[PDB]
């Protein structure tokens, strides 16, 4: 019937021949400006460093706003990104949403970020990603909210897949590969059994398993088993 479905097929077929990230973000900017929004951003929240989870982001906002993030790092306290952790629902911005951290919202509204929304999604590799879209005027009605939801959902799905395929620095975290014995021994450590129990069930001497443990610690760059097990569980390798 044309409209949405033909649009999705056309966008997919048009994004297929694009072999560069800048082309992907160019078509994204063109579509988001067709959707009525001046600014966009694609923001990936990692989950490896638990104390300081690094949030990295691309987009077309004022560059000094980006710089403001690299000084104060509002991604670690921004509620728009943090909504994706608790729920996968789209959230449209308001003064109510940012009551916990009003400094970010006030500084945003200072620089022409007064209307917008942010759709999160859990990527298949456990890395949270969000697509935000913003404009000055024309507060998002409840009528347009579902259309923006569907179109941002399609766009963020495609971008997530493509930027994973293009080996973008945002999506790709520290690459770690394990053969099946290392995955098995690390899984048995994740379902934590003592070393003697592991040796008994696997029927292998303690020296070989300790050699495997040292290999895993070196590969993850760990000082203890807990870092390796937690990082592997978070990254989904186990």
């Amino acid at each position: 019937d044309g409209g949405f479905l033909l649009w999705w097929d056309g966008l997919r077929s048009e994004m297929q021949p694009i072999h560069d990230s800048q082309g992907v973000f160019a078509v994204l900017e063109k579509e988001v400006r067709r959707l009525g929004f001046d600014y966009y951003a694609y923001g990936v929240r990692h989950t490896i460093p638990f104390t300081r989870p690094k949030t990295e982001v691309h987009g077309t906002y004022p560059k000094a706003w980006l710089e403001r993030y690299q000084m104060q790092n509002y991604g670690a306290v921004d509620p728009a990104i943090l909504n994706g952790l608790r729920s996968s629902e789209m959230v449209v911005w308001s003064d109510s949403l940012f009551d916990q951290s009003r400094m970010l919202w006030n500084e945003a509204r200072d620089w022409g970020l007064c209307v917008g929304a942010t759709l999160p999604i859990r990527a298949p590799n456990n890395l949270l990603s969000v697509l935000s879209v913003a404009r000055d005027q024309q507060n998002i009605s409840s009528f347009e909210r579902e259309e923006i939801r569907l179109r941002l959902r399609c766009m963020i799905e495609l971008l997530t897949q493509k930027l994973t395929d293009l080996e973008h620095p945002m999506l790709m975290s520290n690459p770690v590969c394990l053969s099946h014995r290392e995955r098995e021994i690390l899984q048995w450590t994740a379902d934590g059994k003592s070393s003697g129990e592991i040796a008994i069930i696997l029927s292998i001497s303690e020296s070989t398993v300790n050699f495997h443990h040292k290999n895993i610690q070196k590969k993850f760059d760990a000082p203890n088993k807990t870092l390796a097990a937690a990082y592997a569980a978070a990254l989904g390798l186990i």
Binding site: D1, G2, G3, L5
Partner: protein, 298 residues
Amino acid sequence: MLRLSAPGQLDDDLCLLGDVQVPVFLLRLGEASWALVEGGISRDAELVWADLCRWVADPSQVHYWLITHKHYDHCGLLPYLCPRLPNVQVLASERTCQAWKSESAVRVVERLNRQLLRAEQRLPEACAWDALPVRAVADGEWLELGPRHRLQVIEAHGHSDDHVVFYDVRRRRLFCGDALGEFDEAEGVWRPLVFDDMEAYLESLERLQRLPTLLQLIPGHGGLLRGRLAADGAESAYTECLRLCRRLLWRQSMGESLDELSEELHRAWGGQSVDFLPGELHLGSMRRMLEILSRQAL
């Protein structure tokens, strides 16, 4: 070609019996199980039978008859061909069968259909409407007609008080009847027909949008459709009904009489359906239509 219009075969499992302006379709459910669809008119009995026996070894294999509508252009073929078929479960809506039981509706339908007969032919012998093998199908009922056909009845009210549409889920096909309109053979865009209500018509078209995109869309007049214009039919019908609302309200703001516009509608649109509507009663039908448009959806 988008409109598969002529009689005979239309698909792997679907034929068109009789004239395309009042078509009578025929689903081949199985090796010995058939199903006629959409009905016809009284004059075409000896025509449609002559088609049906060509496509069928003997009429006993026909098992179901899916009627979408109450008006004479669909119910008309029932009493003349149903006795011939020894067993057919005529599936019509709950309110359809009430009309066929009613003594008022049968007289109206039979009179309106007897006007269309040519001077020569008399009609075949027929039973009363009350004695038909009917079955009531509710909103959203699942019709397991055969192994290879699963149809869903959707109460597409508004064009009539008992309208339903049968949607083949597997083949993505919709025997929509007059729930959409009279497909303009000349121009290409739809043509609204709201004869009993206007609020319900738009809600029915919203549900027809809620159906997935349609490979085929079969109206009650115009054969079959394919391609894009069969996929946005509910969008196009919603569009055209809104356009007719705009046209009527604008012309009434300009102050011309309500009947003045309806005569223009008859002049523009009745040439297509002159051969299965009387010329005079199209004017009255469009008069009642435009009165409903003026009444509702300001």
